[PDB]
Each structure stands twice: as C-alpha cells, then as structure tokens.
Curated annotation (Swiss-Prot), chains A, B:
Residues 22-251 form the ABC transporter domain. The gene is ABCG25. Pfam families: ABC2_membrane, ABC2_membrane_7, ABC_tran. This is ABC transporter G family member 25. It comes from Arabidopsis thaliana (Mouse-ear cress). Residues 307-513 form the ABC transmembrane type-2 domain. It is found in: Cell membrane. The keyword ATP-binding applies.
Length: 562, 562
C-alpha cells in the first residue's frame, strides 16, 4: 500500500541517428526527469521518436547511435536495475499454445520473490486477471497468426499483466491503450495512476489518442515533435503555455487534440513547429535542466534453480502437446527400419563387407537425423528468448537445461524403435548383451550428434542458414568416418578423430565382430574390428563430445544479452 | 470522381461458435446492410466479435461455425467479388526488406488495371504516399521484430495504402486508426469518408477510440456488445435512441464514450446490457430487417503473366540482397570439395572400387544438400502467401515460376564450384567432354533433387516438420541408390527406380567408365557401368522427376485457397 525501492529516471540530451540507404536524426536533445510517484505521458505524432525514447530509457537501445546520459538513480543502467524495470513493448510476443491463465501463472511463479506460498502467488496471478478484465478469456489460448486465439485487445492486456506480475519500480509502457476501447483505456490509465500515486512507482507511458478525462490523470507531459521536444511540464500547465507563445483553440476542444495539432503544425485559426521549438528552447528548457541538476541521490540457490527448471520444462512440454507430429515420425522411422532390415535380410555373419555397410548406414542415419532436427530448437525460440532474456525472467542455465532435458524423451525412442526391427530382422550377433550394448552406443551417438545441431543453431540463430552449415559438417563427418576412401593420405588420418560418426562406427564394429578371432576361424584385418582406437577411448570421446557440444551451445546463447 | 461498380453488403443472422478446451457464442444474430455510398463504423468493447464479423463479411472466415447469410449484391462471396474487396486486417504482414516506396510501387504495378502507362501507375503510387503522409519514411525499410525499420503507426498506413492501390468497391478496415495520433486518425477518417461519399464506395470500419469529430463522419453505426448487437442505425440517431429506453449522460460528453459505456453496462447515474438487448430486439431490429428484405439487386494474357513474373521475381531478388550468406555457402562447399579431392588424391583410374565410392559420395552430397535447403522456400513465405492469395494479388503460376526461376542461380554455381576442384584434384577421366557431361548430369541431379524438397514443404507448410520427412526420404533414396547392399532380395529391386540418387550414380559411372571395355583390358561386371538402365533412359527419368516434383509442389500450394 506504500512505496518501494524508488527509481529516479533522468535522460539528459538524448540523441539517436541512423544511416540512410548522410544521417537522419530520430531524436535530437530530449531532456526530462521522472521522479518516483510520477505518471508521465509521452505524446507526439506518428513519426516522432517516442518508441526510440522509451526503448532508450528502458535499456533496450544501445550502441554508437545513442549520444545521451540515461541515469537511473544517478548511475547507468546495470543488470541490477533491469530487474526492477518492466517494459511493455508495442509488439506483443507471447507463447501461442499456453492459455491466458497458464501464461500469467508461469510469470507469477517465476518472478514473484520466492519467499511466498504458492497459493499467494496464484492469488496474485488471478488478482491481475480480475483487474484487467481478462476473465472471459481466461482459458483461451494466445495463438499465432495461424492459430486463432484471444482478441487483439486482450493480447495487449495479457502483455501488460505480464509486467504487472513483477512488482517493478520503473514501469515503461509503449502504447498500452492502442487496441482497447474508450472504457478499458480509462480503467487501464486509472490502474496505472493508482500504481504511480498509491504504491509510489514510476510509470512512463506513451499514450496516443487520450481522452479529456484520460489527459487529466497524468502528472507530467512530454510533447514530442519530430525528435525535438515541444513541452516538458505538468499536464494542467499545458494550454497555459502556448498562450505565452500565442496558440489558443478556436473551439472548446480536447487538450490532447490541440496539443497534437500543434505538434504537426496546425492551429485552426507559417512555421508553427519551428516557433514552438524556439519557444521551448528559450523559455522552458533551461528551467527544466537546472531542476534536474539539483536532483541528487546456497541450499536455496539450488532450490530456486530447480524450481525454474521445473517451470520452464513444464511450459516446454505444454506446447509440444499441440503438435501431433509424433506418430508420423515414428511411423516413418519404423518404415525406414523395416526397409533397412529387408534389404539386409539375406545377410550372414560371415559376410563382413556386407555387414560393415549396414553398420555404417546406421551411423549415417542416426547422425544425419538428430543433428538436422536439432537446428530448429533455439532458432525457433529467438524472438521470445530475446525478450525474456532482456527482461530477466530466468537464468540462462535453467533455460538451457530444459531444452536439453526436453529433447531426451523422443530422441531416445526413435533409435530404440529403429534398432528393435533392424537388429532382429537382419539378425545380427544374437543375445541380450550385444543388443543392449548396440542400443547404448546408438543412444549415446544420437545424443552426441544432437549437440552438433544444437551448437550450430545457437551460434547462427536462423534455422535456414544453419541447415546448410550442419549438412556439410555432417557430410564431412560421414566422409572421414571410416567406410569411404581406402588409401587416405598420411596427412589426413587425423581428421577422423574429430568425426562423431567414426567412434560410433568403430564401436558398432567392435561389438559385432568382437576382437578379431571368432570370425577369422570362419574365414578384414584392417577394415573391421582390428583398428587403432579402443572400446573405452571411443565412449570417452563420445561423452566428451556430448558434453562439449552442449557447452558450446550454452556459450553461443550467452552472446545474446540484448 | 464518380461512382464505380456498386456492392451492397448484407449479413443476415450471422452466428459464430467455437469449442471450448459446450460451445461459446462469439457472435449471435447480427443483421445489417451496407449500401454503396455508406460509411459504417462497427463499435464495441474489446471482446465483442468485431474482427470475427469483419472477417466473416470479407470472406476470410468460413466453415461449419458460421451460420449466416453473407450476401454481396444478393449473391454469395465468389472469387470474382473478392477482387473488388479490400481487407485491412489488424496484424500488419509486410515484406521486411523492401522499402515503403518499393512496396507500394509493386502493389500499384500488380493491381492497377494494366491498360495504363507505367508512369500513371507510379504517379498513382506516389499519390497515396502523399495522401497518408508517408513521405518522410518513403525510403525506409519495413523491417521485422529483429530488423528495425519504420514506425508502428507508419506500418499501419502502409497496410492501408496497400489496399487503396486496388481501387476496390468494398473496403473493410479492421481498426485502421489504432496506432495513429489524434490528427492522423482524423485525416484518415476524412480520406475514407471522401472515398465513401465522393467515389461512391462501400467502406466498413471497426473504429475503437473515435473522437467527437470522428464520430460525426460516419453514416451508419453498428454497436456490438458480446456478440449481440445493441444498435444499428444512423450515427446522429444514436443518443436520441437509448432515451426511449431511458439512458442519458449526466455530463456533456463524447457520444462514443457514452455508447461504449452502455455496451459494457455503465450509465454513471442493474441489468443494463440485457435491457439494451431486449430494447434493440423489439423496437429496432424488425424495422431493420424489413428494410433489408426490400433491397433487391490471348496475346495480352501472356504479357500480363510475364509482367507478373518479372515483378514477383524482382521483388524476390530484392530480399536476398539483404543476406550476405552466400560467401559462407561458397567457402564451405569449396572447403568440402577440397576435402573430397584431397582424400582421393592417391586414387587411380584402375581402382574402380575406390572411384565408385567417390562417385557415390558426390551423389549423396548433391542430393542431400539441395533437397534439405529447398524445404525452407515455401514454409518461410506462409503468412504473406496466405494473405496475398486471399487478396488476389497474383496468379499462382506467376508466383510459382519465380521461386523456381529464383532458385536457379546459386543452386547451379555450388555444384559447379564443387566439381571444378573435385574433378581435377582426384583427376578423373580427362578431357573437356567427360567434364562437361559430368557437370551437366550433376546440374540436372541438383535440380531434380531440389524439387523433392520443394514438394515436401509445399505439402507440409512447416520447415521443421518437413526437415524430418525429407531427411528419411533422402536417406531411403541413398539406401536404394546402388552402392549399398550386395544381395538385394528379388522383391525389392524395383525400389531403386523411384530413387533419384540411382540415376545420377548410374550416369556418373557410365560417363567415367564408358561402356565396359577400356577398363577390362586393364584388369566389376555387375557393380560398375554394366547395368540394366541406359544413359538416355536415365536423363529422361531425371527430367521427368524435375518436372513432376515441381508439378506436385504446385498442386500442393493449390490447396491453400484461404
Ligand atoms: N478461435 C477462438 N476460440 C476461442 N475464443 C475466441 C476465438 N476467436 C475469438 N475468440 C474470442 O472471441 C472474442 C471476439 O474476438 P474478436 O477478435 O472477435 O473481438 P474484437 O472485438 O475484435 O476485440 P478487440 O477490439 O479487442 O480487437 C474474443 O474474446 C476472443 O477472446
Ligand atoms: N532503424 C531505423 N532506420 C530508419 N528510420 C527509422 C529507424 N527507426 C525508426 N525510424 C524512423 O524514426 C521514426 C521514429 O520511430 P518511432 O518508432 O521511434 O516513432 P513513434 O513515435 O513510436 O511512432 P508511432 O507512434 O507511429 O509508433 C519513425 O519515422 C521511423 O520511421
Ligand atoms: Mg510508439
Ligand atoms: Mg478488432
């Protein structure tokens, strides 16, 4: 009911220039201060630079283009201050397969301060549904362009409640009432004004068509016009200003309509906007800037990480329930396995050259299949992972060990369904011990080759550009794999040791043909089991690749900090 | 300056129900008539069913859920009436790599009636840029979430000018002023009211926060409230209605704020919305329905198709100029080719088993590489192809023969860059005639295998679900390709004739080892060139597959009519 950790936002001489395809100035000398307990509205035409100003003061724009001082409590934007900052963008990026209640319950479980009952977090999640009026669309999905779900004015309020279930100190909303009608925008502005006045927060909105009652609820007003600001001050002090300059309406009208006609160059009675720029820069802006220079300012760390892992994994399983593309994958891999078992039906144990071809086609198949599906994991989560990474929703370790743990359920049943037909139709080395060793080596090789597609795809966050890198990489792995080229040059025999197909192929041949004595009694001293690498330094390098490719996939997602 | 082909839209008792996860009614008994020369505004809260009503009367919603009569000129919605209907949706789907002027010039070149000068079409394209005020953002890109481009209120006006460059008879706009300020929404409503009054069109908007001057510009007003309508009639007749029911404001306020407070259940003085439903259903709706039952109603065909092909192809090249992922593909395929040429450096012409392995790895490589990149062509164009297919922008044949003609530039230089190193480093059969025949067979096999990935991906419009179908399909093509399995069963020797790897492998072996007499003088009567299929019935089946896979890819895109 009372205040919180206060944030005083100060932006001093913010400029932003882009390069044409000289420069053009999107913002040029914006200066203001938003104290705690204040409700600022950023008004302006539809070209001004309001979303770049609100992306600059939320820490979402940075680089060599910005030329200003964004000071949160007289210090720069750290990651410790981006956790108490809630940013509602214009574009609403939500997960399409969860419902509204499943979305807001996951946000309330992740972001609320964790020294609370689960029932208190769920009651806080349903207390913001009833505040924004999301009760009729509570159990409706939040679908895509293709998936028809909730409305477009309910998708905005779901995104607002997404950042109300943080309890932030600085709330930066970019056009929150665009998409709501005349009486839900009034209730939303009443909610935000209650957050600013009662709870002592710092709310910064960019409202675009405010009513005359909605304009009365703002403390300060920043009027923007083509980057250059025209007015910083109280809302009730506007229209007492501009009569010192000489601009007054001919009709009793809305203050926002008049203040947005002046920002375009219309008075409804010759250089109106330049007159207002020169009038703001000499009568109002130094008195603003002298006002802003005088403002001076372990055992549960495992349980939090495991709760984040369980919440992220349970969300990850809730969106693969929408797809029924799991019986087609099984019925096609089983069909390919019946094909591979029927082509080698007349194969015998004594035909070693006929069976090393089968044991190499298995290594081609289960190195090409998982590695080419794993390049869609991280590129298809890019637009939401960037937003929830900039927001500070979770740690990267809990997010990474949920696509890892979420992939180890059907990438272990597809080679197990392949092998139970292909092993016994071809009738390889009989017994439960070689069958289970072949299954273990195949399940290890699938996880080792899946990490290659994870890493190529975390490094290149595009599933089309990564699908041609991983194709040539896996074909180079198949080429230096052991079945092709006889007289390899002496300078290129080292290239098979970085291949992951080589170790699986050597392990399968060593399981099938033992050590090289039970087949030579029956009859291939260089191509089969007699080789250089052993059976324990081939599972060691497969485990090393299984861990190292996921370490590289984690380090490639660590570069995305924005 | 005068009227056009008139459209009288009539929707009679439109209902729409969806299934929960009984039914819920999104719309329930909506009845209205929009004559030519009329400007109707659909008002309502943010759950009503306005976008489903405007998607129903634009022919974009259909199925077993709709239970009404949508009558355009007393006849159902055909494809001949969807060409004079322009629908502006809420979500703006534009191409991200074109600019604003390049977008609107392409729309003006495609949709204007083609018996006109190109300069007249370009002046009409720049006459709608100056009308909507898109002059400062004229040469700025229209980028994605990732690609920062024009603003969000300029992206709305680009989508409105996208449908103003059609000259339609029925203009259905779904929230066109959500995202514009107070003075661009007034100018947009003035533009649409000028189109309705001067040019005799039929404009249907769904406005959401209208001002008091914007409310004066509508002819008829349809007030919606949770599916059931509350008022159909003139805008000036509202607030003279509801005083027959007994609802009048306590303040002199906006008519839209009062009419949207009544649609929620607020009067600002007990069953307000049910009172208004029962008052509309007995005092106003029969007098509406008796008013709507009394309303009674070759050589250039090649040049148009070629102009559409050139416009669509020139747009297709303008977005692959953004990506610089063409030197990485070349520098990786050249690296793989140096790898394949260095592993077979010590290979001789007499080593036939050593060289059939190389000629089969080439057939693996250039059947796995193009076919796995071609599954991203049509799934990555899905959301814009559906919109421009429902709009009627182009024929499907011109759109299909521009991704076909747009892929035949770098899918012909990658095998040509592979082969110029791999042919002369391994030093295969010397001479310009076998080198050019091998290059021709490789360039034909690449185009034949690219069609497999086009068809699997036009049939499954998802690049992740198609990448696992095409992987197992190409691995089954490699398996029944000719190099693996010696003793194939007699019932499975027919499966190699549907493989595309088989014909390329047979043609490469027949080019390298001739007919089977110049190698047997030097020394493989069953595995090399002596085979069943000839050299002319292997290029014939490759041409048949190159044509048939693209015919199937065209017929799979023909199912998407929505
Ligand atoms: N396919 C669906 N399944 C379930 N509910 C749906 C579906 N489509 C729409 N709805 C619900 O129906 C209502 C109508 O949505 P619609 O988009 O039709 O309304 P709207 O008036 O356009 O809203 P807004 O003004 O906020 O955009 C919304 O509550 C939406 O939640
Ligand atoms: N990266 C860019 N390159 C070129 N021009 C840009 C870029 N980003 C923004 N602009 C232009 O700068 C202006 C500011 O955009 P911004 O989104 O900042 O304004 P806005 O006030 O939010 O508009 P709206 O109210 O319509 O959403 C717009 O004209 C946009 O065209
Ligand atoms: Mg904005
Ligand atoms: Mg709508």
């Amino acid at each position: 009911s009372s205040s919180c950790f206060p944030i005083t936002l100060k932006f001093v001489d913010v400029c932003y220039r882009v390069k044409i395809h000289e420069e053009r100035t999107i913002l040029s000398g914006v200066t203001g201060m938003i104290s705690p307990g204040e409700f600022m509205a950023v008004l302006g035409p539809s070209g001004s630079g309001k979303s770049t100003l609100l992306n600059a003061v939320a820490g979402r724009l940075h680089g060599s283009n910005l030329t200003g001082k964004i000071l949160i409590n007289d210090g720069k934007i750290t990651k410790q201050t981006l956790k108490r900052t809630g940013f509602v963008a214009q574009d609403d990026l939500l997960y399409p397969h969860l419902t509204v209640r499943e979305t807001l319950v996951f946000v309330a479980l992740l972001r609320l301060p964790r020294s609370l009952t689960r029932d208190v977090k769920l009651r806080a999640a349903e207390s913001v549904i009833s505040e924004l009026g999301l009760t009729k669309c509570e159990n409706t999905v939040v679908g895509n362009t293709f998936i028809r779900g909730i409305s477009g004015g309910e998708r905005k309020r779901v995104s607002i409640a997404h950042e109300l279930l943080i309890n932030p100190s600085l709330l930066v909303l970019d056009q929150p009432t665009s998409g709501l009608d005349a009486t839900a925008a009034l209730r939303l502005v009443q909610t935000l004004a209650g957050l600013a006045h009662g709870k002592g927060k710092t709310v910064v909105t960019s409202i675009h068509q405010p009513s005359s009652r909605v304009f009365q609820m703002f403390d300060t007003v920043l009027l923007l016009s083509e980057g250059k600001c025209l007015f910083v001050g109280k809302g009730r002090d506007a229209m007492a200003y501009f009569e010192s300059v000489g601009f007054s309406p001919a009709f009793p009208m809305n203050p926002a309509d008049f203040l947005l006609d002046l920002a375009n160059g219309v008075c409804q009675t010759p250089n109106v906007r330049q007159t207002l720029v020169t009038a703001y820069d000499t009568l109002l802006a130094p008195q603003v800037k002298t006002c802003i220079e005088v403002s001076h300012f372990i055992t549960t760390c495992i349980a939090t990480w495991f709760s984040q892992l369980c919440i992220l994994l349970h969300r990850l399983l809730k969106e693969r329930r929408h797809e029924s593309f799991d019986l087609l994958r099984i019925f096609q891999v089983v069909a390919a396995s019946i094909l591979c078992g029927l082509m080698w039906w007349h194969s015998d144990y004594r035909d070693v050259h006929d069976r090393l071809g089968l044991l190499f086609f298995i290594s081609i198949f289960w190195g090409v299949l998982p590695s080419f599906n794993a390049v869609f994991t991280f590129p298809q989560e890019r637009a939401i992972f960037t937003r929830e990474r900039a927001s500070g929703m979770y740690t990267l370790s809990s997010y990474f060990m949920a696509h890892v743990l979420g992939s180890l359920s059907m990438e272990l049943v597809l080679p197990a369904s392949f092998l139970t037909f292909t092993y016994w139709m071809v009738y390889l080395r009989p017994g439960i011990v070689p069958f289970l060793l072949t299954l273990s080596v195949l399940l290890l090789y699938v996880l080792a080759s899946q990490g290659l597609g994870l890493a190529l795809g975390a490094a290149i966050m595009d599933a089309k550009k990564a699908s041609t890198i991983v194709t040539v990489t896996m074909l180079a792995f198949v080429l230096t794999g052991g079945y092709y080229v006889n007289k390899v040059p002496s300078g290129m025999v080292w290239m098979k040791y970085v291949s992951t197909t080589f170790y699986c192929y050597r392990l399968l041949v060593a399981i099938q043909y033992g050590s090289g004595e039970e087949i030579l009694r029956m009859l291939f001293v260089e191509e089969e089991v007699i080789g250089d690498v052993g059976m324990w330094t081939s599972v060691g390098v497969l485990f090393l690749m299984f861990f190292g490719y996921r370490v590289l996939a984690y380090l490639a997602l660590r570069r995305i900090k924005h």
